[PDB]
Amino acid sequence: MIFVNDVYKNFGSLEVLKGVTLKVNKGEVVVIIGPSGSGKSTLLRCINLLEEPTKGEVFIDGVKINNGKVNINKVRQKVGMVFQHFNLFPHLTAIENITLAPVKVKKMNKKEAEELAVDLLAKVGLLDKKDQYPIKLSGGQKQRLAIARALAMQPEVMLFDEPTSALDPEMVKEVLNVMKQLANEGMTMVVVTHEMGFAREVGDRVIFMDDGVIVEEGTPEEIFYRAKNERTREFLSKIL
Amino acid sequence: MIFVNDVYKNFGSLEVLKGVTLKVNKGEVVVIIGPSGSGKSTLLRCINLLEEPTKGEVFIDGVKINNGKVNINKVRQKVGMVFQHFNLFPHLTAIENITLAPVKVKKMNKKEAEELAVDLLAKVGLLDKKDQYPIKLSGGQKQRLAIARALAMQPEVMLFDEPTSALDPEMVKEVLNVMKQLANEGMTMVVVTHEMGFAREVGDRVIFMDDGVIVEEGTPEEIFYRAKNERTREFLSKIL
Amino acid sequence: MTVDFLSMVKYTPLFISGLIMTLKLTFLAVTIGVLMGLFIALMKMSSIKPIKLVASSYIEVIRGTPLLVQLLLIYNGLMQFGMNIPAFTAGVSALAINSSAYVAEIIRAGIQAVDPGQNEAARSLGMTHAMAMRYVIIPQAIKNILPALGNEFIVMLKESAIVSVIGFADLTRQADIIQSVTYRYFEPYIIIAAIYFVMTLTFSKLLSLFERRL
Amino acid sequence: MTVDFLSMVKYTPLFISGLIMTLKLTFLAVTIGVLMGLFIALMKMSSIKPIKLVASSYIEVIRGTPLLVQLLLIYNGLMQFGMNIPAFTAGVSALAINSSAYVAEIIRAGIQAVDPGQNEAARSLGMTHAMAMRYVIIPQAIKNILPALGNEFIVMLKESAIVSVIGFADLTRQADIIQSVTYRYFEPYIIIAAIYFVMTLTFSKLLSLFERRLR
Ligand SMILES: Nc1ncnc2c1ncn2[C@@H]1O[C@H](COP(=O)(O)OP(=O)(O)OP(=O)(O)O)[C@@H](O)[C@H]1O
Ligand SMILES: Nc1ncnc2c1ncn2[C@@H]1O[C@H](COP(=O)(O)OP(=O)(O)OP(=O)(O)O)[C@@H](O)[C@H]1O
Ligand SMILES: NC(=[NH2+])NCCC[C@H](N)C(=O)O
Ligand SMILES: NC(=[NH2+])NCCC[C@H](N)C(=O)O
Ligand SMILES: [Mg+2]
Numbered sequence A, B: 001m002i003f004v005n006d007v008y009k010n011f012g013s014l015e016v017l018k019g020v021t022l023k024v025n026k027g028e029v030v031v032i033i034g035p036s037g038s039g040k041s042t043l044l045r046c047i048n049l050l051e052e053p054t055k056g057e058v059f060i061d062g063v064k065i066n067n068g069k070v071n072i073n074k075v076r077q078k079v080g081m082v083f084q085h086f087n088l089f090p091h092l093t094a095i096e097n098i099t100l101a102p103v104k105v106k107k108m109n110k111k112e113a114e115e116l117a118v119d120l121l122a123k124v125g126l127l128d129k130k131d132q133y134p135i136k137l138s139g140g141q142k143q144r145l146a147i148a149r150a151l152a153m154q155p156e157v158m159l160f161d162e163p164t165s166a167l168d169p170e171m172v173k174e175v176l177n178v179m180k181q182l183a184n185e186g187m188t189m190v191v192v193t194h195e196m197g198f199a200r201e202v203g204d205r206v207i208f209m210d211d212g213v214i215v216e217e218g219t220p221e222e223i224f225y226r227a228k229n230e231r232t233r234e235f236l237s238k239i240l
Numbered sequence C: 001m002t003v004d005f006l007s008m009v010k011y012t013p014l015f016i017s018g019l020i021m022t023l024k025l026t027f028l029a030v031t032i033g034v035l036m037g038l039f040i041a042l043m044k045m046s047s048i049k050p051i052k053l054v055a056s057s058y059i060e061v062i063r064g065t066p067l068l069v070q071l072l073l074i075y076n077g078l079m080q081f082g083m084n085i086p087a088f089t090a091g092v093s094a095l096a097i098n099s100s101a102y103v104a105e106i107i108r109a110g111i112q113a114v115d116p117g118q119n120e121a122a123r124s125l126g127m128t129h130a131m132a133m134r135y136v137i138i139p140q141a142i143k144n145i146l147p148a149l150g151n152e153f154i155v156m157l158k159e160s161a162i163v164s165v166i167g168f169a170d171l172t173r174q175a176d177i178i179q180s181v182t183y184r185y186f187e188p189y190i191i192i193a194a195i196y197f198v199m200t201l202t203f204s205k206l207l208s209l210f211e212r213r214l
Numbered sequence D: 001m002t003v004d005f006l007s008m009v010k011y012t013p014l015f016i017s018g019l020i021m022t023l024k025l026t027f028l029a030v031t032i033g034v035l036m037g038l039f040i041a042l043m044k045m046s047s048i049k050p051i052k053l054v055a056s057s058y059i060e061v062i063r064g065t066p067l068l069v070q071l072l073l074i075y076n077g078l079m080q081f082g083m084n085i086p087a088f089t090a091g092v093s094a095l096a097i098n099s100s101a102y103v104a105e106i107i108r109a110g111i112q113a114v115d116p117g118q119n120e121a122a123r124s125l126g127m128t129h130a131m132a133m134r135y136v137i138i139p140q141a142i143k144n145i146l147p148a149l150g151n152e153f154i155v156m157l158k159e160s161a162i163v164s165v166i167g168f169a170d171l172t173r174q175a176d177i178i179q180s181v182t183y184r185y186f187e188p189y190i191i192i193a194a195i196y197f198v199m200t201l202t203f204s205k206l207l208s209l210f211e212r213r214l215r
């Protein structure tokens, strides 16, 4: 399903990924943590090719997607992404944000799209906001809407790039809960987060990254209670 | 020492402070908490008059400072301020950042100032950066440098406006530690923070603000375990 | 002699005729410069390297080079080819061309000003570049561009005074006319300045207001 | 007839002379426009209402009004007062005044552009507005200002072509001179445009390159 194979990424002289490998299968919840600038988000963003590796390859469902020999749109249809800064469409209403892509990408019938959308709004607790514009929403509301929007394309895996890090503290739980609910429903997920509670509670697997490399990984209990590596223990001691 | 008396603040149509009163005596560590937009930082900034109350008065050392019948600079000489976004002077080296105000405001001799600066740098663990420029420092180092700089003016109270909110997680502790050390040394402090651990560890008093009002206050354990008010409870439940 | 503004009053219709001419000149020039400008920008977005090169060269040359020289190049420089284009078509052409380059830049920059997150989200949801552009990016780019077009017009009002030197009967040319019958240059010039100023203020208010409405 | 650029070759000394004159004009005006501009800005910062009013009115009127009209106002408009100021001093005066307004704005904005936190920290450490200004804000405003000054100059090169209509022998005026002896307008205009372009590119390259070192 997801196979990132020995990738490197550089932005100019800045080396960000230095040979990283990640495999994730259906139903896993994989959580990536580590100090700032360690490359977490860049790895995440290689998976749906919002970043292009300098070397190495990324395969989805067994087909290489960074060889220029594939339709990248169909790929991104399967691989959803939730952004730290929401990236809601400001000129579109809540429902419209949700239904835009199904109607334009999948060619869904509009009544059907509207019904999908109301279901998703109802799920993330935003039904009474269906005709509001993003501006009128709180951070929590914005991220919940974005999540609904990504779910509307019914992807097989959801990527979350630090989805609560730009939220006020009173606003974090409500997004994390929605994330947890998705995990409890078997959604395959790769989450980059600074919220260790989420990793502990619903991660099936936790990846610790430092200086552009994966330095240790294992189950939540392994990383948070029995970490073998020194860098891991250090990071955790500063964070917890 | 500090007496904010029934103040109000509006930025245009936005009512931020709606009648707030705060008294702090020498040696207290007062911590202000609350949901975003409740007026915490604005209250904080009324104390050294970086904001001007629309109504109400603020007295420091028993003299009113928002009637224009006082030398405001000399007031601010007594009341230090530490900023969320550091506000280091980029064109000045570390030592120069520190010694700038004493030399030009207090008219201290340059050798005396230089010695003060090296003591403070050693204290906050930045001695090896004395000749470096802010651009070369990490967030933690920046905030510790700003703290050294404020201390160099030997104030009688220190104000902290969310001093770790812009720090990476691995970087929070080192700043909090410096703050705690000051608390253990009897420094008078008013801190607006999202880090409840600081209040727990060294706070004498916790002030909870909601919608431009102080709705509840008490000692940290009173607020964190035995909050009387429903808003306090709601906020803490989304936050703890 | 000494200054006499009252003597100037009877010449009101000439100022008004000149003013009306500056407007007509400028509206028409900008209008054409926009349509042309949109077209030029589209070319610079073309993947076909020669075309992007041509549009880039066009823009660079026109913006890096004086409007006056372009005017004279059209008016004077074309005579020797058996061309006798009026002052008006010369002016409109020059201004529309100059304006077209500046507008092409305005467009490119209005697009570049929408947060890249919007495009990222659009693509991440499976939308192609075309769909992201039509449904997400362009509607926002436009709101960036309109106020800068509005500002382009205001600038071109001042710019248009330059067709006076070519003998076009704009607002600035009037001062010659009047002095030929009054021997006074100062007073009609002051009056002309006042008029340009009031036009500038008026349109600045109006745009800003429209801007405040977006 | 038909185009003949070779015939134009012999007029090189005229082109070069026109160029040097465009340089001389723009430099002097911009230089003066800066000193004036600085002075105008200081006035707009005065607490004394009349002075700030005058600086604002000066700035607003000059920027809100065509350079041509200012040129002619000085040149033609002053004659009836028994004034016969040369083309050079007319151009220099007009350009320096115009530039003074735009430069005044540039300064105000270079100051407004330094993060307000800097002033907040300066003042919080007990410093007066004056001290904050001298040691913290102005040194940074300056780095905001220098690149926009450099850009003003580049713009003014193009702008100065307008003293040709007043009969000053700049780079643009040459095309008249040359045609008087060749009956050709086209080719010398192309050549002149090209010179303006190459000048624009040269100075643009330098300036940005200057900006990067600065920041
Ligand atoms: N498109 C880009 N162009 C240039 N540099 C980039 C780009 N994207 C990321 N970077 C830089 O690469 C580095 C790695 O960033 P990344 O966000 O992957 O690290 P991270 O471990 O997720 O950090 P954090 O926990 O702070 O989000 C950062 O310095 C970032 O600023
Ligand atoms: N100088 C100012 N001008 C205009 N608006 C301001 C100014 N200062 C603060 N505000 C606004 O007043 C409101 C109150 O902000 P304040 O920072 O006091 O709340 P807060 O409790 O500190 O919130 P947070 O915890 O999110 O920082 C905010 O919406 C802010 O945007
Ligand atoms: N369309 C425009 N905004 N043109 C600006 C022209 C600027 C200057 N007068 C020149 O001719 O170079
Ligand atoms: N100093 C300047 N940048 N002046 C710009 C002048 C713009 C325009 N040509 C006018 O006369 O209004
Ligand atoms: Mg990141």
Ligand SMILES: [Mg+2]
Binding pocket: B041, B042, B162
């Ligand atoms: Mg705040």
